RNA sequence: ACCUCGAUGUUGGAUCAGGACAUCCCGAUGGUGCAGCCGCUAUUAAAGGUUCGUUUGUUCAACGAUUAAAGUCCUACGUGAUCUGAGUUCAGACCGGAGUAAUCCAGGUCGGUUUCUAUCUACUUUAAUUCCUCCCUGUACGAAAGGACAAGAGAAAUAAGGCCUACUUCACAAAGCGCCUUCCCCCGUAAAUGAUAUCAUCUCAACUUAGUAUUAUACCCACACACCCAAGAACAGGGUU
């Protein structure tokens, strides 16, 4: 009655109009995504050709899994699937409005309802011509590597061999207590411990008469980015854009991670035969095979590896 | 290319006081050569030791990798593994109470 | 942490979550409607569905007998669950039960929830109705789909 | 452990009169068409609601009373029949439990 | 039709397209190397090349005491005893380094895990390392060996006898008292078995699964 | 995993190994810098009241997969300069010894059998 | 004998540690009664690290086995509104001793209640290290014995941060016993040219190098019902096409 009531879209849609606006809404936003599909023909920004010191715009890719993988030196390597789900580049900000020197690239990916974003975030992807994205990540970039905004990205914009960052929020583990969020080792189970058994011990000594601030304290854990760095790209299949990371990624299955060239020194300098800006399918300079293999890898069907 | 044949040629060269030869089947899961040398003193072991060891080393086999020498502190035994043949240098009163040649041939036919 | 744990913790612990839920599993078997606080309710609502599943296997099937007598602690219901219920639903894949939220308890102010299988002799629910198509938003949108099926 | 001083007033409004204690305003709350009792979005009118349950008490002591002891749960569908109401072809073979109202509006 | 138990996912909220993705790649590996059908309590050879020695492959016979893992990393651990001496392998089914799977006795044990092998007595682990494979009718059932294996004495590494474990191939009335196993009755939990949600339908999942094996074919 | 106070077996043909005694032999020490043995990693041993070092050749704990898991904690009775006690050992022992950082070229070369 | 005798035992241990450097290890240097390895000594360095057991209540200590090392200290001999009460301390009792006795004892021994619901302050998410093996190389050096630097690769281990494909505890998920990743330095001196003092002189002379923190980065960045959730105590957060 005061008027702040809070609507959603379908609130006032009678049983005919839902799906109606569903389907209408659905095939509008898969038809955006086509018109993508073909961005060197939409007037692309100037290709450069890749220069040491040159950065590249990175992806936004789900966390699909993991599963095994075996090295032609019989070795095991636990790899994570990440998939990338309606990657689009949506924003191209300069060094002197970039909170730094280094221009940046935002990047969405995993198209979301309308339904259920702010009005101005609706606004600006509307004006982007894309359907909305659920994260949005900024990439420094070199001025060498823009790419207009609206251009899609691909898994194969990586290549087997090269080594990434892959950065997320951590699993959410709640306010923990000090045992599990710090590893602290708790009191003894018996031998007449009372009521301690996995409390803080002394927080701090008597002198300072206070906590030093950044004490190790019982609270939330995880929920927080964290970034695994140097993971070994170890294959790409281009059919459904999945990116085979070595290793551990942060986050639970299902997630977003923000993944981009590792920023170790040891790999400073690896970019120079990875697609400089982006890969661009519609370039069709070659069109890659459903899956590419780092040189290592045990590919399935290949004859079983004899150690001769 | 480093073989059995380089092995023996080696050994003979720098006069080992006796040289034994195991030809292990494929079926048993350790390697293809299994030879067996004495010698005077552990002092002529090390030196024939590191220098069949440089040989190999410095032969072939740049991506074949590089290899141990198991028994430097003892002084009665030492032992280089290779990619498929293994060589156990010793002093004839180690190689007598070890009789490896029986073990070696005679797999369950001993004591 | 209770990450991808689909079961409430009720009652005085396993057991007694599980007779917790077969004595409303009965009563909502017996009565074909019944109140109850919203999560009993909420996790009660699968094993409804299931036993009405088990009632579709059939009166003979050793396991769905086996299932019945076990959770229907009333045992006139079991001949009721397999010759009433199933046979009502046999067209139906799922969607069994209707479970719609009623005003808190005034007891103590319990989130309530009425349950029902569909179908039943009583009187009908107040259901949620969607707004008419005539409404003026659901006029312009029936204009929108005229005009895209006649240009598309 | 004891309080080390007496909390002020002042202090204790600060505490008790935050807005994260202050009840909110619920704005989910609006008119049911069909009876324009006030109701929320999510939930069963209360008037409406209570007016079912009364029905529904009314059938299930006619089915008690049909019934006669526990344990007597017919292996037969049920159908209510209201005052000038007659079973239908459909009703055949189903138990009648008789009303002596009049069919209420809103039941169908 | 045996759909192995690596193709049926367990139950979760990771993405189906996993799933089809090493499922493909499993496939792809069984074209490669022929992943017999075997359950629990089968007798099975493989052979794998081993990389500590240079392109030769070692044998291990002994019997398929467990099946865990699901997707490409499913493994089998068997069991046997050399020389007196009880020895177990967990092996990849889709390693790239196991040459050969071969089913010396195809046989389904009273239980799906065979793990009390462990307590039981050296006889019902050992078996000839050298025998011979046994020959299945084209069209016949596979053979449910009944076998109740006689237990050692009562420390064992699990309590086998507790109904959670629901142990059908030990003999317990030879190792335990009545008064144990009354008290091991202690655990029950009657209620477990009618839980109706508990229960994991893959009824759909196998028939997809099987669509893809056949596309694949 | 073998710790501190485990009991092993010791698997050897050595007279300190095979002879009788009031208590098992225990491992008094693991020459790891985390007291948890493995197999390949060298431990002290009270045996007969002695302390003699011997390496670890089998564990009832699980190990990576295509290795093996034996019923007991085997162990190899070792000298200070790293010949074996005896010389002969019955019981399998895992091949993976092979390419592990270390010595064990002795070991394999008095083992009967490997798995 | 200055504060506290108008409810604070004490010692050890547990937990968690903050700090000093007069450095135990790791780093960089000068000298050497340092040929090499090694030590000895001194300068600089506090980023990091600094073991597990038997006896004993023990701090210490001895012993056993290790380690790169098992540093010296301060913090109310840090820390009992976090824990423990083994020594010692209260009421019981012995041994020995003193005392006429009552009793007592710096001694030996057996036993002996450890409360607190947190009002305020403070606080509760701030670029790894070592060791071993190998290459260099049983090369330098050395008569031999012995045995390097520097640089690089591989293994582990630990620490930190994550994760579940496998294994294991288990089971729609949480864990470790499992797996994955971890990135630059710090300055003591040694030199070049060169005056005061026409040589020389590394220079609290001007000047030229080793010589670098001006951490490099990375991370995060969208002003504006209900249900479900890998998000969560509430709240918040994400999804509902
Ligand atoms: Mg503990
Ligand atoms: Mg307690
Ligand atoms: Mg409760
Ligand atoms: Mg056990
Ligand atoms: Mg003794
Ligand atoms: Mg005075
Ligand atoms: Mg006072
Ligand atoms: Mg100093
Ligand atoms: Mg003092
Ligand atoms: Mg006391
Ligand atoms: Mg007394
Ligand atoms: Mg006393
Ligand atoms: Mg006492
Ligand atoms: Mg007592
Ligand atoms: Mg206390
Ligand atoms: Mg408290
Ligand atoms: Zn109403």
Redesign the interface.
Known sequence: LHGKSGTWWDEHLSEENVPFIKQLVSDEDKAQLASKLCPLKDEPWPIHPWEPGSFRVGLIALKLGMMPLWTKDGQKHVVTLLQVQDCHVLKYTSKENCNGKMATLSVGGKTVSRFRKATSILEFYRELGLPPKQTVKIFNITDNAAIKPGTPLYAAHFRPGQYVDVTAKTIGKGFQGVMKRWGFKGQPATHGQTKTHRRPGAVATGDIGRVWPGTKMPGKMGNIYRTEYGLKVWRINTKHNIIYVNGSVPGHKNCLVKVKDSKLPAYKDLGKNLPFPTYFPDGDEEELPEDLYDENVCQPGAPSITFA | KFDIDMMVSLLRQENARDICVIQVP?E?????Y?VIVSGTSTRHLHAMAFYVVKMYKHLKCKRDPHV?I??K?????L???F??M?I?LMLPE?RE????EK??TL??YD? | ISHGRVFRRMGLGPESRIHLLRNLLTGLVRHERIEAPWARVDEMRGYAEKLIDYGKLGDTNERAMRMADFWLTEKDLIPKLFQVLAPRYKDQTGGYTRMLQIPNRSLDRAKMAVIEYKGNCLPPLPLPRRDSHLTLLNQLLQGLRQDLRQSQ | AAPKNRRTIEVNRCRRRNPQKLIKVKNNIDVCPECGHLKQKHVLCAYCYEKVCKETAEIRRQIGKQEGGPFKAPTIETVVLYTGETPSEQDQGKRIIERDRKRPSWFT | RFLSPEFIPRRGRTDPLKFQIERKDMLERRKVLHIPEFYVGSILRVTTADPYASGKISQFLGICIQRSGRGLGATFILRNVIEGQGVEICFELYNPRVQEIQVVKLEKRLDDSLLYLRDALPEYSTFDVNMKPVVQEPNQKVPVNELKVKMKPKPWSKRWERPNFNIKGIRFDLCLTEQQMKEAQKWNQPWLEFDMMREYDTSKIEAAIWKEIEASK | AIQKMTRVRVVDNSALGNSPYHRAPRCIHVYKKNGVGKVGDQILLAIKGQKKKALIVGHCMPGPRMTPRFDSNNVVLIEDNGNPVGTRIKTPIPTSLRKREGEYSKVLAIAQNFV
Do not use: A, N, Q
């Open positions: 494929p048993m899961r350790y390697t293809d299994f141990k198991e028994g502190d003892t002084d009665d035994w032992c280089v593994d990619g498929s293994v156990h180690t109470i070890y009789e490896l073990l070696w797999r369950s004591d």
